[PDB]
Amino acid sequence: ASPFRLASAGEISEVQGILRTAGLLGPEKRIAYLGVLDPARGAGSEAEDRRFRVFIHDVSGARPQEVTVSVTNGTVISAVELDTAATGELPVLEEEFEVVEQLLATDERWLKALAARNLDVSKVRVAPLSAGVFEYAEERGRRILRGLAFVQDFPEDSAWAHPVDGLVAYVDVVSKEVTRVIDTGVFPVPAEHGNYTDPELTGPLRTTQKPISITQPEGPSFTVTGGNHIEWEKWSLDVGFDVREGVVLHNIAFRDGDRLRPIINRASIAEMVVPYGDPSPIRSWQNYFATGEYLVGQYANSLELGCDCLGDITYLSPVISDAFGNPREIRNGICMHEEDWGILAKHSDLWSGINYTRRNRRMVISFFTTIGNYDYGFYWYLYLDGTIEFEAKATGVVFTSAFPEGGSDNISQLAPGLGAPFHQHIFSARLDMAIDGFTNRVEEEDVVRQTMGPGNERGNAFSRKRTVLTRESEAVREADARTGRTWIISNPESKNRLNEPVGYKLHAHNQPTLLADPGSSIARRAAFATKDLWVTRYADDERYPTGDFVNQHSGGAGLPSYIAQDRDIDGQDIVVWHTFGLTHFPRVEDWPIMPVDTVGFKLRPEGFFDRSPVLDVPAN
Amino acid sequence: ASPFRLASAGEISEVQGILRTAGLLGPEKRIAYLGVLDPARGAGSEAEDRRFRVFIHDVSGARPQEVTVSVTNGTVISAVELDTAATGELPVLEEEFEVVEQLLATDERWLKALAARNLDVSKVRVAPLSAGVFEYAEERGRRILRGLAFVQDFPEDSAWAHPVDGLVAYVDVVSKEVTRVIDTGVFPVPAEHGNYTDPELTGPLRTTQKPISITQPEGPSFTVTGGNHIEWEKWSLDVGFDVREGVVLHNIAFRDGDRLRPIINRASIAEMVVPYGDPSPIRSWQNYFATGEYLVGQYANSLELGCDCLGDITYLSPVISDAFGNPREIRNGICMHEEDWGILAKHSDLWSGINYTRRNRRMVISFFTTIGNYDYGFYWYLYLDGTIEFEAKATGVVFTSAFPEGGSDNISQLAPGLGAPFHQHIFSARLDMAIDGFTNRVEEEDVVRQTMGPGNERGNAFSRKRTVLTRESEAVREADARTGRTWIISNPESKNRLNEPVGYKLHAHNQPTLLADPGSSIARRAAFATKDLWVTRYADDERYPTGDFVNQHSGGAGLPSYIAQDRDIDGQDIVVWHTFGLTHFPRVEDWPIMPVDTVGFKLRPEGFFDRSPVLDVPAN
Ligand SMILES: [Cu+2]
Ligand SMILES: [Cu+2]
């Protein structure tokens, strides 16, 4: 029914059938990406034609293809051959990651490197990482993965505690060749284990934690209809899921009186990159785009009740395609629940004698993914007062290396001889805005200090200024915490009762952006990460800040290319791209398993309503 | 038993008796401040002498006094006459705020101003505010309060909705004279009411919220002994309460194996200033130090179970003295409870096949105070991983004015003709550090970008740098969000197993600091608010960043004076003073009652432990 419904197992199977029938999915083909296409702007087609987009990989080396199909009409709408050496390789297949360790196990150079370190190949695990784009001419036209070694002493051992430094190998996953084996020298392999479930390391488990029971006797306050349409405390939205981006929120709107007022048309984390800052040749190439290269939704965890999600939880089990086009369900991959959120508003008035207190609550929509040693949680929150917030939670096991005898300026020591290279976790939130409709504009708001003098004799006055970003070329902005800089998305054609354009204010955490030298490969490939805010004019094919094909793709696509069009964004259908991230200098406390660290952003109403929208909240 | 125990009603009664019998509490005397004194450095002297510090005001204009008494021996240890014209006026008495409206009610100038506006004097409430600035000549030596008018139509009416602009009066509360009435012109009094409990404004109340039950079948995981000593998940501390500062945390320590390791000796919000940025003569002097001038602890609210504090709550009911020395209990003034705090650590490992998830929780200690129209919540959090955090919650009703015809650059419009002047809420957290002992030092840590070239050919490297603050003259620091600046408090004499000084890292929110012109009276009186972080050498008499007698003092007192001593702070008993605040440009959504907005800071372990201190947390 709803054109925003989740993809069904049936639709996935249908796509597979359509491709097979078209002669586009024979035995040598693989689905590297498959997702449902969002409806185009405006009620074009009389009805809603369900379409899917697919990236088809060829294991024999033939050029891949991008194909769009109509599952409703059973037809291929478009199919284009891709020149990967130019526009980029398709995302990595889960089945290719396994290829690396296997191939290296039979390579003389690799075996010789392990023998030199007295390491048994059968106990050496190899972490397969994306290759990026550097100075290796032979990699032109090759589908490459780079491997870093870790020793696993036994089946349940945490290999991350035993990094094999000074060694790295490059592999052509298609031709099944080891292009290079680099050995910069033998480094002692850290000896201590990092088995956080081992009693000798955890010591006796504490028995002081009493239980906390969180329940909802009458059930949750939100309703779920059409499989993924949420209605909660005036909020309305559709919870989508894409194998690349993960959870995606659609049609976020708020009920104000007799009308449903749109706020954000589509909200997603369109990219997430983890750049490493260790200049060692062994890892200086290390940068993985979880979203763009790996597809985070694909690795979403099945969330356990009471453990991952506590309270009255309503689950969604999104379906994705496997490498052959078969539907695969991610059971309980999405948690949805509401939670108490402290005091919302409070005032004890002496004159009126009235004491008033109201509590707040928020709707939570989340999923958690695992990328090798890292695990990331994605959380979207909706508050009673109209605030929208996103929060990323980073945990898992830190990527390790050896710790240099002479110390290091780019690595921290976690244990004897065990290092943790410095790195960042930078996200890009793509917010297709729709403040009271699609006619929107962005204003940069700065606090303004005033000089003592005429009109300000006491020197106490302070103000603010707003600058409307009118063209894309002027919409690449930097944060400025010192001046309390924020960005307001308003609708110049929709005013509140005080005759002011309605709006929402974006509050950033103002964390450092990409630190890499501007001339670096990563600065170019992750250009979006160098600035805090970008505003573009909406366009169907501008989906990710890094373009459609990130794997082994040079700069040239993404935000810098979109912005160049210098389109009008003053009172138009626009998209805000907010960069935010964490800069991680690992601490001893992050070992053997790290406690969650967080980062995000939020948007609060700014003259969107005619007064507080929570005056109708009961005392309960 | 414990020298850090809360003051008892009996102790207050004893102080009253001691003062009375000593002839220091005559009919004209008033207790402007009364608090127990913390133990001095060195608890070697068995059995501590319970001493109280008292500020005695004299309503006849006679010299006030600072008296120290011993309730243990029942004697007056010291009594010093105060020269208010030199060292500042004593905190405002609750009974003085009341005299302002009463005195104005009989002043011909005031009555004429109201008559011209057709306002019934019996319906005009007067918000009594501190002098706000120091300048006027005739005010020197004179104990002044200023008054701003608001119309209350009926007993339960919210007067804040009806400000009477263009009018302000100054009152000498001791001589009981109206020194001046300034009328700059008539402004319409905003017509709409702001009664948030009126169905007319709230509309039909929501019936969509289902209950959320939060319980603890086996009780809380924390224990409370000695009335205020808390032990929870390895944490140990004493919860104190002072009429000026409110909740104060003492001896914060963490159990690491067989050792109780100290982290912070005393933590408190030593000051909180609210400067207004409207250049109008009616309010350009407006600045109130809630802590220093009003005493926030005095106005702490009684917190209702299931409303202000939800869950399994353990209350503390601190006792304070009234203006006459009588004990007054603040029933349920302090809430204490633990709450679930999502996922603590998580990792699903492919190689080991082990899936691990642990949840986090925080211990919460809080109180809420009401200062006229504003209501502020103070929250201290202790996390399982060793993190300590403070969070202030600002709510209540915004201070209003008229919204001038033609607009304003320093006031926002909340309703027809109703304005809300721009202002800030800036706090100062005084942290008497004790990282593994009193020998501490502070290092400013900045992220360091590196240029591509030799040793960094790919231009991916990035580092960090730490600068030790060795003398107070170089310990006045500013934030730098761009470089991810933080401050680490370490103990150079206590190292972790990796031979590195143990420490804790302070993460600020990097919000704007005091915006007023550098030459303003407020910039001098609240100099602490102009810089993000100050470090001083510990001293018994250096309690507040604004000095002991903030009211009507000329400026420079507190931090600027302490810092001028230029003492050694490199490996010494030091105190960190962190300035943090909110810059408020009121929104329509903040009217008629504002939803909570927050600010805070946190400190996380930085090489304090030898590995993660939460490996012993059970799965459950
Ligand atoms: Cu990290
Ligand atoms: Cu405010």
| Alpha carbon distance B15, B50 (integer Å) | 11
Q: Which residues does chain B have within 8 Å of residue A339's beta carbon, measured at their own beta carbons? A: 212
CA of A126 from ligand 1 middle (Å) equals 20
Are residues A330 and A319 in contact, defined by beta-carbon separation less than 8 angstroms? yes
CA of B397 from ligand 2 middle (Å) equals 9
Backbone dihedral angles phi then psi of residue B206, each to the nearest 5 degrees: -65, 145
CA of B511 from ligand 2 middle (Å) equals 14
| Alpha carbon distance A255, A382 (integer Å) | 13
Are residues B238 and B4 in contact, defined by beta-carbon separation less than 8 angstroms? yes
Among chain B residues, CA nearest to A417: B498
| Alpha carbon distance A567, A557 (integer Å) | 17
Q: Can you give the length of chain A in residues?
A: 620
CATH class, B94-195 region: alpha beta
- Asked if B520 lies within 8 A of A620 by C-beta distance, the reply is no
Among chain B residues, CA nearest to A463: B410
- Ligand closest in space to the Cα of B397: 2
- Asked if B368 lies within 8 A of A346 by C-beta distance, the reply is yes
- Asked if B618 lies within 8 A of A517 by C-beta distance, the reply is no
| Alpha carbon distance B231, A136 (integer Å) | 59
Token digits of residue A164 = 């094999």
Q: Can you give the length of chain B in residues?
A: 620
Residues 6+ apart with CB under 8 A from B201: A611, A615, B193, B194, B195, B592
Q: Using alpha carbons, select from A240, A223, A248, A225 the residue that is nearest to residue A7.
A: A240
SS3 B2: coil
Among chain B residues, CA nearest to A368: B346
Token digits of residue B165 = 């602009």
Q: Which residues does chain A have within 8 Å of residue B422's beta carbon, measured at their own beta carbons? A: 462-464
Amino acid at A413: Q
Among chain B residues, CA nearest to A211: B216
Closest partner residue to A461 (CB to CB) among B279, B353, B589 is B279
Q: Using alpha carbons, select from A530, A517, A519 the residue that is nearest to residue A558.
A: A530
> What DSSP assignment string belongs to A96-119?
HHHHHHHHHTT-HHHHHHHHTTT-
Backbone dihedral region of A443: left (phi > 0), alpha (psi from -120 to 50 degrees) or beta?
A: beta
> What DSSP assignment string belongs to B38-96?
PPPS-TTSSS---EEEEEEEETTSPPPEEEEEETTTTEEEEEEE--HHHH-PPPPPHHH
Backbone dihedral angles phi then psi of residue B397, each to the nearest 5 degrees: -115, 135
E runs forming strands in B349-434 = 355-371, 374-383, 388-396, 401-402, 411-415, 418-421, 423-433
What is the DSSP code (8-state) at residue B410? S
- Asked if B214 lies within 8 A of A340 by C-beta distance, the reply is yes
Backbone dihedral angles phi then psi of residue A110, each to the nearest 5 degrees: -65, -45
CA of A539 from ligand 2 middle (Å) equals 40
- Asked if B617 lies within 8 A of A206 by C-beta distance, the reply is yes
- Ligand closest in space to the Cα of A582: 1
Burial class (CB in 10 A: 0-12, 13-18, 19+), A331: exposed
Q: How far is A176 from chain B (nearest CA, A)?
A: 22
- Asked if A460 lies within 8 A of B352 by C-beta distance, the reply is no
Token digits of residue B15 = 């102080």
Q: To 5 degrees, how large is the angle CA A151–CA A153–CA A158?
A: 70
For the sheet with B594-605, list strands across it.
B314-316, B334-348, B355-371, B374-383, B388-396, B594-605, B501-508, B486-495, B441-449, B462-469
**CB contact burial A7-40 (16+ within 10 A = b; e otherwise):** beeebbbbbbebbeeeebbeeebbbbbbbbebbe
Closest partner residue to B310 (CB to CB) among A359, A609, A611 is A359
Q: How many helices (H) and strands (E) does chain A have?
A: 7, 34
Are residues B312 and B220 in contact, defined by beta-carbon separation less than 8 angstroms? yes
- Asked if A276 lies within 8 A of B460 by C-beta distance, the reply is yes
Cα dihedral sign, B146-B148-B152-B156:
negative
SS3 A129: strand
Closest partner residue to B589 (CB to CB) among A159, A522, A609 is A609
Q: Which residues does chain B have within 8 Å of residue A220's beta carbon, measured at their own beta carbons? A: 210
CA of A424 from ligand 1 middle (Å) equals 6
Cα dihedral sign, A513-A519-A522-A526:
positive
Q: How far is A58 from chain B (nearest CA, A)?
A: 26
Helix (H) or strand (E) holding A9: helix A9-21
CA of A133 from ligand 1 middle (Å) equals 22
Residues 6+ apart with CB under 8 A from B390: B267, B269, B378, B379, B380, B381, B429, B600, B601, B602
- Asked if A152 lies within 8 A of B608 by C-beta distance, the reply is no
> What are the beta bridge partners of residue A267?
A249, A431
SS3 A219: coil
- Asked if A618 lies within 8 A of B209 by C-beta distance, the reply is yes
Whole-Å CA distances, A399 to A191, A597, B535 = 16, 15, 36
Residues 6+ apart with CB under 8 A from B307: A357, A359, A619
Token digits of residue B377 = 């919540």
Deposited experimental method = X-ray
Q: Which residues does chain B have within 8 Å of residue A332's beta carbon, measured at their own beta carbons? A: none
CA of B425 from ligand 2 middle (Å) equals 6
Whole-Å CA distances, A465 to A91, A468, A605, B157, B386 = 44, 10, 18, 35, 41
| Alpha carbon distance A586, B264 (integer Å) | 23
Among chain B residues, CA nearest to A232: B208
Q: Which residues does chain B have within 8 Å of residue A352's beta carbon, measured at their own beta carbons? A: 152, 155-159
> What DSSP assignment string belongs to B376-396?
EEEEEEEETTS-EEEEEEEEE
Closest partner residue to B354 (CB to CB) among A197, A372, A459 is A197
Closest partner residue to B452 (CB to CB) among A196, A278, A520 is A520
| Alpha carbon distance B590, A268 (integer Å) | 29
Strands A418-421 and B65-70: unpaired
What is the CB neighbour count within 10 angstroms for residue B17?
15
| Alpha carbon distance A17, A36 (integer Å) | 16
Among chain A residues, CA nearest to B386: A589
Q: Which residues does chain A have within 8 Å of residue B616's beta carbon, measured at their own beta carbons? A: 202-206
| For testing contact with chain A, the best of B162, B349, B498 (most A CBs within 10 A) | B349
Q: How far is B19 from chain A (nearest CA, A)?
A: 31
Residues of chain A with CATH 2.70.98.20: 196-619
- Asked if B156 lies within 8 A of A354 by C-beta distance, the reply is yes
Q: Using alpha carbons, select from B477, B478, B482, B479 the residue that is nearest to residue B449.
A: B482
| For testing contact with chain B, the best of A236, A349, A381, A601 (most B CBs within 10 A) | A349
SS3 A534: strand
| Alpha carbon distance B222, B313 (integer Å) | 11
| Superfamily of domain covering A196-619 | Copper amine oxidase, catalytic domain (2.70.98.20)
Token digits of residue A284 = 């200086």
> What are the beta bridge partners of residue A499?
none
Q: How far is A180 from chain B (nearest CA, A)?
A: 18
Q: How far is B254 from chain A (nearest CA, A)?
A: 14
Helix (H) or strand (E) holding A13: helix A9-21
- Asked if B460 lies within 8 A of A516 by C-beta distance, the reply is yes
Token digits of residue A175 = 């031709």
> What DSSP assignment string belongs to B498-523?
TS-EEEEEEEE-------S-TTSHHH
Give the experimental resolution in Å.
1.8
SS3 B165: coil
Closest partner residue to B216 (CB to CB) among A211, A395, A482 is A211
Q: To 5 degrees, how large is the angle CA A557–CA A563–CA A568?
A: 145
Helix (H) or strand (E) holding B116: helix B108-116
For the sheet with A441-449, list strands across it.
A314-316, A334-348, A355-371, A374-383, A388-396, A594-606, A501-508, A486-495, A441-449, A462-469
Q: How far is A401 from chain B (nearest CA, A)?
A: 15
Give CA A530 to chain center in angstroms: 16
Q: How far is A23 from chain B (nearest CA, A)?
A: 35
Token digits of residue A287 = 């940068």
| Alpha carbon distance B130, B552 (integer Å) | 8
Enumerate the H helices of A150-285 as residue ranges: 199-202
| For testing contact with chain B, the best of A347, A496, A580 (most B CBs within 10 A) | A347
What is the CB neighbour count within 10 angstroms for residue B10?
11
Q: How far is A454 from chain B (nearest CA, A)?
A: 10
E runs forming strands in B438-512 = 441-449, 462-469, 476-477, 486-495, 501-508
**CB contact burial A508-527 (16+ within 10 A = b; e otherwise):** bbbbbbbbbbeebbbbbbbb
- Asked if B216 lies within 8 A of A221 by C-beta distance, the reply is no
Are residues A280 and A270 in contact, defined by beta-carbon separation less than 8 angstroms? no
- Asked if B517 lies within 8 A of A345 by C-beta distance, the reply is no
Q: Using alpha carbons, select from A585, A165, A117, A191 the residue that is nearest to residue A416.
A: A191
**CB contact burial B187-210 (16+ within 10 A = b; e otherwise):** bebbebbbbbeeeebbeeeeeebe
Q: Which residues does chain B have within 8 Å of residue A286's beta carbon, measured at their own beta carbons? A: 460
Q: What is the CATH number of domain B1-87?
A: 3.10.450.40
What is the DSSP code (8-state) at residue B524? H
Are residues B252 and B237 in contact, defined by beta-carbon separation less than 8 angstroms? yes
| Alpha carbon distance B316, B329 (integer Å) | 10
Helix (H) or strand (E) holding B104: helix B94-104
- Ligand closest in space to the Cα of A288: 1
- Asked if B211 lies within 8 A of A203 by C-beta distance, the reply is no
| Alpha carbon distance B457, A279 (integer Å) | 8
SS3 A95: helix
Are residues B592 and A611 in contact, defined by beta-carbon separation less than 8 angstroms? yes
| Alpha carbon distance B95, B30 (integer Å) | 10
Size of interface A-B (CB pairs under 8 A): 445
| Alpha carbon distance B273, B376 (integer Å) | 12
Token digits of residue A199 = 């009693």
CA of B374 from ligand 2 middle (Å) equals 8
